[PDB]
Amino acid sequence: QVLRGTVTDFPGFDERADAETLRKAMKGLGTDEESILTLLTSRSNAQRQEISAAFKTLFGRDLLDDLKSELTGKFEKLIVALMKPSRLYDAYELKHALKGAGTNEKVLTEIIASRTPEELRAIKQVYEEEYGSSLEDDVVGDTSGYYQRMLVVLLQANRDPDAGIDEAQVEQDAQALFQAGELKWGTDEEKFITIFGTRSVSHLRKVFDKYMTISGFQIEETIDRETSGNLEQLLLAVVKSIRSIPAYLAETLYYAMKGAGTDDHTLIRVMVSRSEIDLFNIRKEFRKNFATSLYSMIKGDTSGDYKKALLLLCGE
Ligand SMILES: [Ca+2]
Ligand SMILES: [Ca+2]
Ligand SMILES: [Ca+2]
Ligand SMILES: [Ca+2]
Ligand SMILES: [Ca+2]
């Protein structure tokens, strides 16, 4: 399918002109957040990096340090995130879910399950450069059990490529998965980890069909998203990503705003990271699955300059 983002290079871009607009906006008493916000959400990530350089050439000041001393709250978290160069974002997000006591298993599952092999290679590469330690050793050092192993398997970015679809292997995997599901994924974990983690995307889709034409239940129906289980949360995220990455991220966003509070960190992470990849496709899945639009949900769930920036990122 064709992936379309909501943010694209801004025509007639001038990094010096933009460097100055931002300077006048930060300069002196009071800040013009309305100006920063509108400027930053209509320039691609590559352009924001160019604005930063020109800002440094013209004033000898660091644009980001400035935005941080001037901005505050979720609006700042959102601006700081947009500034992060595209290639460094998932790696940064991953270093901070692992870093320190505990682990944000949520981010680890979300990024590793929804990212393609090419994306994971580049992430593994950029991560070691930036942080010195390899992603795989930090994951292995923070996670455990079959959760760790499944994450490590996916981290190898070695899913079979899509080619000849043997129906003998398909039915064999469907049966296996069926029986592992009936056992609530608590037995023979080794066998299913290999199927979910190394089988080609087109293969696993036939497996998901067959599996249901064996049980009458979609494979996800054998797992409760709401409840615990790191390994199950991962199996759920993988299944959904194998079906549709936008749909999976379309839902991750939904559950970020659905409830008593708002998971602004997820809301910010998915909005920013996918803005130039498939945020558009994500918007289309959100509407068709949740009967409402992302725009309209973000508008009612967030407030202020923060809300305005998300809405401009969202687009229509
Ligand atoms: Ca100021
Ligand atoms: Ca003000
Ligand atoms: Ca501040
Ligand atoms: Ca830790
Ligand atoms: Ca809410």
Curated annotation (Swiss-Prot):
Point out the cross-link Glycyl lysine isopeptide (Lys-Gly) (interchain with G-Cter in SUMO1) in this chain.
27
> Which residues form the Annexin repeats?
13-84, 85-156, 168-240, 244-315
Keyword Ubl conjugation among record annotations: yes
What top-level branch of life does the organism fall under?
Answer: Eukaryota
Gene Ontology cellular component terms for the protein in this record: collagen-containing extracellular matrix; cytoplasm; cytosol; endothelial microparticle; external side of plasma membrane; extracellular exosome; extracellular region; focal adhesion
Mind telling me where the Glycyl lysine isopeptide (Lys-Gly) (interchain with G-Cter in SUMO2) cross-link is? 27
Q: Which residues carry this modification: N6-acetyllysine?
A: 68, 74, 77, 95, 99
Q: Name one GO molecular function term.
A: phospholipid binding
Tell me where in this chain the PTM Phosphoserine is found.
Answer: 35
Task: State the span of motif ([IL]-x-C-x-x-[DE] motif).
Answer: 312-316
In what way is this protein post-translationally modified? S-nitrosylation is induced by interferon-gamma and oxidatively-modified low-densitity lipoprotein (LDL(ox)) possibly implicating the iNOS-S100A8/9 transnitrosylase complex.
- Look up the record and give one Gene Ontology term from the biological process aspect: blood coagulation
Name positions with the PTM N6-succinyllysine.
Answer: 288
Q: Keywords on this record?
A: Acetylation, Annexin, Blood coagulation, Calcium, Calcium/phospholipid-binding, Hemostasis, Isopeptide bond, Phosphoprotein, Repeat, S-nitrosylation, Ubl conjugation
Associated disease: Pregnancy loss, recurrent, 3: A common complication of pregnancy, resulting in spontaneous abortion before the fetus has reached viability. The term includes all miscarriages from the time of conception until 24 weeks of gestation. Recurrent pregnancy loss is defined as 3 or more consecutive spontaneous abortions.
Function, as annotated: This protein is an anticoagulant protein that acts as an indirect inhibitor of the thromboplastin-specific complex, which is involved in the blood coagulation cascade.
Subunit: Monomer. Binds ATRX and EIF5B. Interacts with hepatitis B virus (HBV).
How are the domains described in the entry? Answer: The [IL]-x-C-x-x-[DE] motif is a proposed target motif for cysteine S-nitrosylation mediated by the iNOS-S100A8/A9 transnitrosylase complex. A pair of annexin repeats may form one binding site for calcium and phospholipid.
- Family named by the database record: Belongs to the annexin family.
Per its record, how is this protein called by name? Annexin A5
Q: What species is this protein from?
A: Homo sapiens (Human)
